[PDB]
Design a protein around this ligand. Sequence first.
Ligand SMILES: CC(=O)N[C@@H]1[C@@H](O)[C@@H](O)[C@@H](CO)O[C@@H]1O
Ligand SMILES: CC(=O)N[C@@H]1[C@@H](O)[C@@H](O)[C@@H](CO)O[C@@H]1O
Ligand SMILES: CC(=O)N[C@@H]1[C@@H](O)[C@@H](O)[C@@H](CO)O[C@H]1O
Ligand SMILES: CC(=O)N[C@@H]1[C@@H](O)[C@@H](O)[C@@H](CO)O[C@H]1O
Ligand SMILES: CC(=O)N[C@@H]1[C@@H](O)[C@@H](O)[C@@H](CO)O[C@H]1O
Ligand SMILES: CC(=O)N[C@@H]1[C@@H](O)[C@@H](O)[C@@H](CO)O[C@H]1O
Ligand SMILES: [Ca+2]
Ligand SMILES: [Ca+2]
Ligand SMILES: [Ca+2]
Ligand SMILES: [Ca+2]
Ligand SMILES: [Ca+2]
Ligand SMILES: [Mg+2]
Ligand SMILES: [Mg+2]
Length: 431
Amino acid sequence: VLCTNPLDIGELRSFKSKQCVDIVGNQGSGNIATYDCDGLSDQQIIICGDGTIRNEARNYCFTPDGSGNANVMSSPCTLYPEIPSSQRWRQGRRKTFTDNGGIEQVATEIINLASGKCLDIEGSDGTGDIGVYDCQNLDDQYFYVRSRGPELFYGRLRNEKSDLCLDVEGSDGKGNVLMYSCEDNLDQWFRYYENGEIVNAKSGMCLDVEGSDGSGNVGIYRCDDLRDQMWSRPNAYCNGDYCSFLNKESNKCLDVSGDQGTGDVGTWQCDGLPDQRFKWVFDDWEVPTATWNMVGCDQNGKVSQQISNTISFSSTVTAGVAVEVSSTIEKGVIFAKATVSVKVTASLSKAWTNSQSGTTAITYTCDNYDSDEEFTRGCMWQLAIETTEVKSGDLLVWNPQIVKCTRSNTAPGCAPFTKCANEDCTFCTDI
Ligand SMILES: CC(=O)N[C@@H]1[C@@H](O)[C@@H](O)[C@@H](CO)O[C@@H]1O
Ligand SMILES: CC(=O)N[C@@H]1[C@@H](O)[C@@H](O)[C@@H](CO)O[C@@H]1O
Ligand SMILES: CC(=O)N[C@@H]1[C@@H](O)[C@@H](O)[C@@H](CO)O[C@H]1O
Ligand SMILES: CC(=O)N[C@@H]1[C@@H](O)[C@@H](O)[C@@H](CO)O[C@H]1O
Ligand SMILES: CC(=O)N[C@@H]1[C@@H](O)[C@@H](O)[C@@H](CO)O[C@H]1O
Ligand SMILES: CC(=O)N[C@@H]1[C@@H](O)[C@@H](O)[C@@H](CO)O[C@H]1O
Ligand SMILES: [Ca+2]
Ligand SMILES: [Ca+2]
Ligand SMILES: [Ca+2]
Ligand SMILES: [Ca+2]
Ligand SMILES: [Ca+2]
Ligand SMILES: [Mg+2]
Ligand SMILES: [Mg+2]
């Protein structure tokens, strides 16, 4: 039912305008066009290994509305008799570029399997309605799944002067940022990326300075890709594990009013005082490891099984535990002795977060191998992710509804969010 073999999850953006590919409203169904990236789950696009393109708000598919140069909308996925070629997409030619945040991105044509037409934005400026059109090589026919680069750090941010935490007023992760007692609420948890964004765990929005010039009051606001939402954490400004954050637009320090570390937060001329340094506060979890478990095999037909999302742990997987685990996964995961790519860890982290508020069991059938050929025999494999909370020694095992269908009794040789390159899955593409 859901996409069991995803390749990537994130914002799908125009190479040309850098706008998000957007479904009208926030429910994950309706017309598709460009829009400002607004952090809602419908703009979390799922690139499925079966060729479909879906989203995190609703299990619907990018679909052309008819033949020829048609409009594209988010519509119900046709599953029977099979997924039609018209709801399936391949990648065409590629263009790479370094974005304003300094991250290497990879854009490609996105080409409909039925028509051979390119996903397209009306006109040439990369803004407006989205349909399918003759592939004509213009930049607005190239799309990338936005990478933030690696997650560098995460946790609450404890002030060196006051030992209070960087706080957002209330508990929804929206609004003014100020110093407050450290609390077991998610609005105090942030994740800091190579692109410079510091993203609030509760709201998914960005640490922001009022206006555009990087000087003034700090709060949480829609992530807008601007330089005043980019922060550096230079070694020079650290004192052990307490470091300053300098705004990229203004070169001013993240600052607490006065010198006691207790008041409102803004940006100000760096002054080297302890109230301008903060330490990341988080619990140690071991680097997670990914493996595949055999669910069933059939040497002379397709395999069909109930697939559940399950988690095992010594205590409750609270919102607190879940944020620790998500942030741990994003930092790095091991598969077959090697680290996986940034897009694998970003996507796995998103899958984990989206797995917390279930999740019912599905009946899944291996109709095709992960490599795309018709499944006539082989095994179904389900992902397992293991980590350990260091302070307790307690093992956490996560079995998401992520599956690989292969021709082989040998476990897949490919990490989740990468594609088996052959039927036996001995090497990989889309790493
Ligand atoms: C909150 C909400 O639903 N926002 C959506 C936004 O994401 C975008 O799709 C826009 C298109 O006109 O429609 C709404 O404003
Ligand atoms: C010495 C002292 O308190 N300096 C602070 C400075 O660090 C900054 O917070 C500024 C904000 O307006 O207020 C004071 O001047
Ligand atoms: C040169 C140019 O802008 N061509 C666009 C084309 O790319 C496509 O979007 C089409 C859809 O109707 O509109 C045309 O105006
Ligand atoms: C639709 C999609 O996933 N596109 C590309 C993907 O193919 C891969 O190259 C990746 C590397 O991070 O970047 C993405 O932008
Ligand atoms: C339960 C709750 O929302 N508490 C918040 C607190 O976390 C802090 O942000 C404070 C700042 O004045 O505002 C309170 O409303
Ligand atoms: C165009 C512009 O500068 N918009 C800023 C916005 O980025 C955000 O900082 C907001 C916070 O209130 O203030 C606005 O004035
Ligand atoms: Ca939307
Ligand atoms: Ca166009
Ligand atoms: Ca708060
Ligand atoms: Ca701003
Ligand atoms: Ca100060
Ligand atoms: Mg459209
Ligand atoms: Mg403030």
